[PDB]
Design an enzyme around this catalytic site. Sequence first.
Site, mmCIF file in Angstrom:
data_model
loop_
_atom_site.group_PDB
_atom_site.id
_atom_site.type_symbol
_atom_site.label_atom_id
_atom_site.label_comp_id
_atom_site.label_asym_id
_atom_site.label_seq_id
_atom_site.Cartn_x
_atom_site.Cartn_y
_atom_site.Cartn_z
ATOM 1 N N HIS A 88 -4.280 -10.537 14.153
ATOM 2 C CA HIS A 88 -4.285 -9.268 13.384
ATOM 3 C C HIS A 88 -2.858 -8.901 13.055
ATOM 4 C CE1 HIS A 88 -8.549 -8.673 14.073
ATOM 5 N NE2 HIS A 88 -8.343 -9.042 15.371
ATOM 6 N N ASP A 91 -0.201 -3.458 7.746
ATOM 7 C CA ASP A 91 0.468 -3.211 6.430
ATOM 8 C C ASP A 91 0.380 -1.678 6.265
ATOM 9 O OD1 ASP A 91 0.910 -2.665 3.465
ATOM 10 O OD2 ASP A 91 -0.314 -4.399 2.872
ATOM 11 N N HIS A 93 1.089 1.197 3.605
ATOM 12 C CA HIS A 93 1.435 1.478 2.199
ATOM 13 C C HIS A 93 2.543 2.519 2.099
ATOM 14 C CE1 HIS A 93 -2.577 0.188 0.132
ATOM 15 N NE2 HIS A 93 -2.070 -0.820 0.861
ATOM 16 N N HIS A 128 -3.588 -0.891 6.775
ATOM 17 C CA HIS A 128 -4.689 -1.851 7.005
ATOM 18 C C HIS A 128 -4.186 -3.162 7.557
ATOM 19 C CE1 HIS A 128 -4.062 -4.275 3.288
ATOM 20 N NE2 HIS A 128 -3.768 -3.123 2.692
ATOM 21 N N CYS A 129 -5.066 -3.934 8.143
ATOM 22 C CA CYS A 129 -4.763 -5.303 8.586
ATOM 23 C C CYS A 129 -4.701 -6.184 7.345
ATOM 24 C CB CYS A 129 -5.826 -5.720 9.581
ATOM 25 S SG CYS A 129 -5.499 -7.334 10.346
ATOM 26 N N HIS A 139 -10.871 -8.654 6.954
ATOM 27 C CA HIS A 139 -10.462 -7.718 8.040
ATOM 28 C C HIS A 139 -10.585 -6.288 7.557
ATOM 29 C CE1 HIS A 139 -8.573 -10.439 11.205
ATOM 30 N NE2 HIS A 139 -9.189 -11.272 10.369
ATOM 31 N N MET A 144 -10.765 -2.572 9.465
ATOM 32 C CA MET A 144 -9.353 -2.486 9.918
ATOM 33 C C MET A 144 -8.506 -1.749 8.892
ATOM 34 S SD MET A 144 -8.588 -5.779 12.280
ATOM 35 C CE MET A 144 -7.279 -4.912 13.092
ATOM 36 N N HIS A 249 -16.619 14.721 -3.872
ATOM 37 C CA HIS A 249 -17.105 16.012 -4.368
ATOM 38 C C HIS A 249 -17.592 16.853 -3.204
ATOM 39 C CE1 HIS A 249 -19.139 18.676 -7.261
ATOM 40 N NE2 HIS A 249 -20.034 18.818 -6.365
ATOM 41 N N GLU A 273 -13.890 19.626 -9.926
ATOM 42 C CA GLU A 273 -15.270 19.452 -9.421
ATOM 43 C C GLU A 273 -15.356 18.193 -8.567
ATOM 44 O OE1 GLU A 273 -18.470 18.743 -12.524
ATOM 45 O OE2 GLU A 273 -16.773 18.300 -13.855
ATOM 46 N N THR A 274 -14.834 17.091 -9.068
ATOM 47 C CA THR A 274 -14.910 15.746 -8.473
ATOM 48 C C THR A 274 -13.578 15.117 -8.709
ATOM 49 O OG1 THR A 274 -17.244 15.710 -8.905
ATOM 50 C CG2 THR A 274 -16.145 13.553 -8.559
ATOM 51 N N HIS A 300 -19.573 10.910 -5.364
ATOM 52 C CA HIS A 300 -20.521 11.326 -6.406
ATOM 53 C C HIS A 300 -21.006 10.159 -7.247
ATOM 54 C CE1 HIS A 300 -22.862 14.182 -8.749
ATOM 55 N NE2 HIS A 300 -22.489 15.175 -7.974
HETATM 56 CU CU LIG Z 1 -7.289 -7.792 11.549
HETATM 57 CU CU LIG Z 2 -23.314 17.004 -8.142
HETATM 58 CU CU LIG Z 3 -2.962 -2.633 0.919
#
Ligand SMILES: [Cu+2]
Ligand SMILES: [Cu+2]
Ligand SMILES: [Cu+2]
Lengths: 341, 341, 341
Positions: A88, A91, A93, A128-129, A139, A144, A249, A273-274, A300
């Site tokens: 494993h 990373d 971001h 994330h892995c 993964h 992960m 939403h 709204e969304t 949604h």
């Molecule tokens: Cu992993």
């Molecule tokens: Cu709705």
């Molecule tokens: Cu990424």
Amino acid sequence: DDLKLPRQRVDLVAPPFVHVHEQATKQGPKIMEFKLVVQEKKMVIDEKGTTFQAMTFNGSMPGPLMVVHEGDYVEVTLVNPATNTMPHNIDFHSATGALGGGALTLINPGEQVVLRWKATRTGVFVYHCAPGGPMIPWHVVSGMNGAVMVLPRDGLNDGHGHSLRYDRIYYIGEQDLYVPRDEKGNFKSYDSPGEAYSDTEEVMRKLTPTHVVFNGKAGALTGKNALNANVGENVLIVHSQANRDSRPHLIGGHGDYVWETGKFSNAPETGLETWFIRGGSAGAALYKFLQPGIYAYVTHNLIEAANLGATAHFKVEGKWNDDLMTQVKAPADIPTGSTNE
Amino acid sequence: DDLKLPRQRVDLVAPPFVHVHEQATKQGPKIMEFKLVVQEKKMVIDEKGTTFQAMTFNGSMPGPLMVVHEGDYVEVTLVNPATNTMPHNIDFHSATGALGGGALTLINPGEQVVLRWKATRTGVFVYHCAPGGPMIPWHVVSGMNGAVMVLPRDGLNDGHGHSLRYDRIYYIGEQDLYVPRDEKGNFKSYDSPGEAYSDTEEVMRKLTPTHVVFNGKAGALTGKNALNANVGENVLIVHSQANRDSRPHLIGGHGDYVWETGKFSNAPETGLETWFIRGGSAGAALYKFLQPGIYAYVTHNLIEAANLGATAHFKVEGKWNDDLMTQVKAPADIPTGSTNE
Amino acid sequence: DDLKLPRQRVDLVAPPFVHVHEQATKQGPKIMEFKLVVQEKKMVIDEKGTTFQAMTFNGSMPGPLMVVHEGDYVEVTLVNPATNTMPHNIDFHSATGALGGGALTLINPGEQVVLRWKATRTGVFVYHCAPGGPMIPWHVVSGMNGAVMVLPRDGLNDGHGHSLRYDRIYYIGEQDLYVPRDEKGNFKSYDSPGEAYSDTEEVMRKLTPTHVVFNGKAGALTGKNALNANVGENVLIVHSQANRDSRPHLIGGHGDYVWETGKFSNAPETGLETWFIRGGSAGAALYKFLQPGIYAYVTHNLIEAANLGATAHFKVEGKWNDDLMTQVKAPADIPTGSTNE
Ligand SMILES: [Cu+2]
Ligand SMILES: [Cu+2]
Ligand SMILES: [Cu+2]
Ligand SMILES: [Cu+2]
Ligand SMILES: [Cu+2]
Ligand SMILES: [Cu+2]
């Protein structure tokens, strides 16, 4: 050249809750120390009891939310106990260089590694892995992934020089899952992640999840585990999706201030709204509750929300405001003198 | 009424490179002359050698990037040599009228046509073939798409009155492909585009690509064809997708300034992790490299990126900055005195 | 505590047209009264005559556009005639509380209900049926969705203190449909919505529509029902999608001012090629027509647009502007002295 800053150890908590933190701070930069322990384990993912060979940071889907401030250093100890079967890594971001840290954190079972990254970019971000090649998506869609929030030292603002402060914070991690089925359509069970891989990859290649869940399983955030709030509270909802788009939403509410790309150097949008979480990102929405009762928080695509698992509930205490909404006449038989064509 | 401006002939180059151009200019408007030659041909699209009946502008997927300035006229000669089997045309999303030019450019094999359009709208834009009806999606997903960039005459800016200048530019065209399979799951080969059509349309109707590639094939921009940069360079990455959404991410980096809807009349967003190219559009991201090494540029549906072809690499030369990121402790056995539960 | 405002009854009209309304108003707040009548009925959805067991507000897909101003109250009478088979309700994304009104509007066949909500949020918003559980997506994708527009009392603006006024307004409701097929691939017909449900849910679960249509059927807004405009008119195009993302594009035009998240407290983006309607939302685009002729308005997944139903046409009257675009040379044989390799 040793980095001579104060150190602060953070105890992570399981989502959808968040470790204690300050919004605005006058503390200077610190080295914020976190530990993540990989756990491979079978988990239940739906209300019919379907099991799944999951891979997790800290035993949860999503992994826990980490919270720091702009200019902090983040020192992460990643642990891969010898009971696990796979290598494993991690990373971020939020981080700059070495594939987000993945190129410096690959550990076999029985090993640990310590990565430090400077929190130079404000926002909410996915972690994330990403071991390499086809292992990267596998993964991630096995669980992960989590998120980190890098607050401005002055806390959030509306992009027009006004401070925004939340009363409560929740972290909603959304997970797309790819569970194989047998010839009769029933979900298949496996004794290990490796045994599940070949059949799982076939489902993944068709890019249609079998399940889309919040906090790791259908119904995780409904019933007794509904999210609590009160009328008048400003609630921050952090939403992440490491692999696939989502459209959050709040049913019966709005996003008062939304950073749908998740980065606090950009002014939020108002009154949505969304909103839209692009796969591979986190976003965040503030809402001040104005009405009591049950709210459903969904993606949604309503098929995903109702039929594949992607519904949470808020239970909001307070007094109903009949000015904002009222039932003028309760359900009644259609008057005999009515037309209606 | 003849248009009496200076004429300038541009020699196009194959993506991901870009023909020479000026960012800021004090030249007045010109008639910028481009030629595009349609080529139908079989192409290799993945690392196992799968072939595909492609249709291209200038022999490449994507077609080449055209670069002009606001107020220029763009005079395009579209050529359909008699070795091709199909009629073709061209639709510029940068242009006003006649379906983007498609209603003025339909040519049979053995014909050519000359279209002029005024570059009144700044941004990066898709161009694509669009013969009519079901031929529109088929020609586009067979490879007949590229992009054009209309720069402001003063070059790019941050939307807050500061000039932005790139040191390097790359054009990443992303292509969704729909390759038929036989009963055993193997990709089918055909002797012509027409022979491939009926089986291809069936795959297209289910809206799930078999391949998602940059620069026309899986691995096109990895290995020896990785994209070069240096620490300190500001790199513009233009990304287009003529038919299907994408979510670009630079693994180990960020988007410092991103126009995800691609239009330079709008201020860019800052500090993004992942951005979103809506199908039928181009977007652009600037990034100043801060760390050396390998970066992976992906669509952040990681299944698409790792398993369907959609990964590019940057190889970045320079000095590592241990303040931004460092490996505090290399992988080591978990201490016997550790807990970790 | 009775609400003592003037009342105004609105007569709704079928999409893509819109009931008469004022853009800017100096009227104070009013109670705006609307009636929606649920109609379950078989409808034709494509050019081959495929039928579908639809469920509608007011007999149309989409339901009609409602237009009010900020601060108005909206009093909706929802009617479920006894010829219908199912309970129904209504959720307004514009409204605050009680799941958007759904928790106050559940009516059996033979009943009606009256809901009032305050229009506190400006923008275009989805409304839809949402009876509970798996019925929510099924009612929505069976046609039970429309939109409401809450204008600022001063009308629209560009977010930089300039008024924007439309000459014409159209409402484009996009519908994803999930029609079962038999073993030979032919679409199945049913005698009731309940009889269609089990087979329909199976198609819905795979998240791939069989049809994507504007105004309820493939070709609804082409041919004799093309949308009219004139050169120089500023046209507002409201687009909604209650369940699934869309990427609108006006072929041969642009979005001059686009609110892709649909909320008029946010400044519009300028000069877009393609915009993005997140599933569960409405957006809006202004365009001033500059050229006469046919325009195609699509979702720019061109497979959806050409092959699943999602194309509308505008027919625009006026004079062609050869400065913006011209055919310099009509199609002609490639000169014998040409190279082109
Ligand atoms: Cu992993
Ligand atoms: Cu709705
Ligand atoms: Cu990424
Ligand atoms: Cu073509
Ligand atoms: Cu197009
Ligand atoms: Cu209903």
